[PDB]
Amino acid sequence: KVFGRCELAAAMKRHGLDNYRGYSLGNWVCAAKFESNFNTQATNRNTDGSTDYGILQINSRWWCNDGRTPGSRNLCNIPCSALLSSDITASVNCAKKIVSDGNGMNAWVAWRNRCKGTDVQAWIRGCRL
Template sequence: MGSHRLLLQLLALLTTVTKAKVFSRCELAHILQEEGLDGYGGYSLTDWLCMAFYESTFNTAAQSIKADGSADYGIFQISSQLWCTDDRRPSDDGCRIACRDLLSSNITDDIICAKRIVRNPPGMNAWEGWAMHCKGRDLSEWVEGCDL
């Protein structure tokens, strides 16, 4: 009986650790700043916040299936076609990561992969949400009141 309870506690702990999260704007701003994204690849912290909002509304569990059968995962909606592997179809796996790992509340791996993506020639244009809603705009409102 004791080992059964221990297993249940372990499963509960694992579920808690990998649970998805919807970040507040300022909470995410602080994390992205701590992770060195302000200025990374020539893009400001506000670019990264605006992109994450239009890609996932700051939800780490966001997933969207594309017409070609690929899918986008996590807070930055990272593509399974190019950057991560899932069970749907073959991938270039540019970030060497399982797509499901991009869905947890720990976004360190998402950030590492996003840095790799932005180093490529399209830069942030790789994200349609950023290109349509953030590019070339005054984004100062994204960090207002965040105490950065």
């Protein structure tokens, strides 16, 4: 599913991401924009042989099982395929664990390089939330 911007903002808000670990909704929408272009089916192979999955490009090295990432972990206890669903529940639940891991949203390199310190409220402008 390719979410619309305000459609994704609403879904994230309903699942309790707005201000989760102090990160406003615009931060999460901005991260999704640059990680996936709001496409739940996005996958990208990393140099280390792990893969990133879904709207927030969650990596198989630590967070989900894809059966092809050596000496990995599965800290969200989910198949990486669950991160590709039209329903963002698994992605959101796993993102909450990631952003609680100690470096906050810096875990998402694209958030740090493209969202951090920017006017992220622009990402929810116009939305009926």
